[PDB]
Design an enzyme around this catalytic site. Structure first.
Site: not given
Length: 129
Positions: A35, A46, A48, A50, A52, A59, A101
């Site tokens: 990562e 990203n 969209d 967002s 990270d 995120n 989650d």
């Protein structure tokens, strides 16, 4: 801060991640390698809108607040800049929430693609723990 592989493995073990939700330490070190390449300050934007953050690339749309992501939830209840510190405590505590989650470690794309189903024990080799 860029961690050494066994340096991060000991940090993560100290923070309760070995066999956390049945995921051995090697899974967690592998996920951080692919990562962020063990860099606490890694950020990825990203499309969209967002971003990270940190060694585990958490995120901004759902987990931390960075003030620039539309429709953000701040589920871990932290500023995203706290995921960018040399101390991995904030990232490990939020990752504990994310792995529980409903998708296990499938939440991290680099783990699904480069660690899932592999010999993840190689990632702890030579570590004293």
């Amino acid at each position: 801060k860029v961690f050494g592989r066994c340096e991060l493995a000991a940090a993560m073990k100290r923070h309760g991640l070995d066999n956390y939700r049945g995921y051995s330490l090697g899974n967690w070190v592998c996920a951080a390698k692919f990562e962020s390449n063990f860099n606490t300050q890694a950020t990825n934007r990203n499309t969209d809108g967002s971003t990270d953050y940190g060694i585990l690339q958490i995120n901004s749309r759902w987990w931390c607040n960075d003030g620039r992501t539309p429709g953000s939830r701040n589920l871990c209840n932290i500023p995203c800049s706290a995921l960018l510190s040399s101390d991995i405590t904030a990232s490990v505590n939020c990752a504990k929430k994310i792995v529980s989650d409903g998708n296990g470690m499938n939440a991290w794309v680099a783990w699904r693609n480069r660690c899932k189903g592999t010999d993840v024990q190689a990632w702890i080799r030579g570590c004293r723990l």
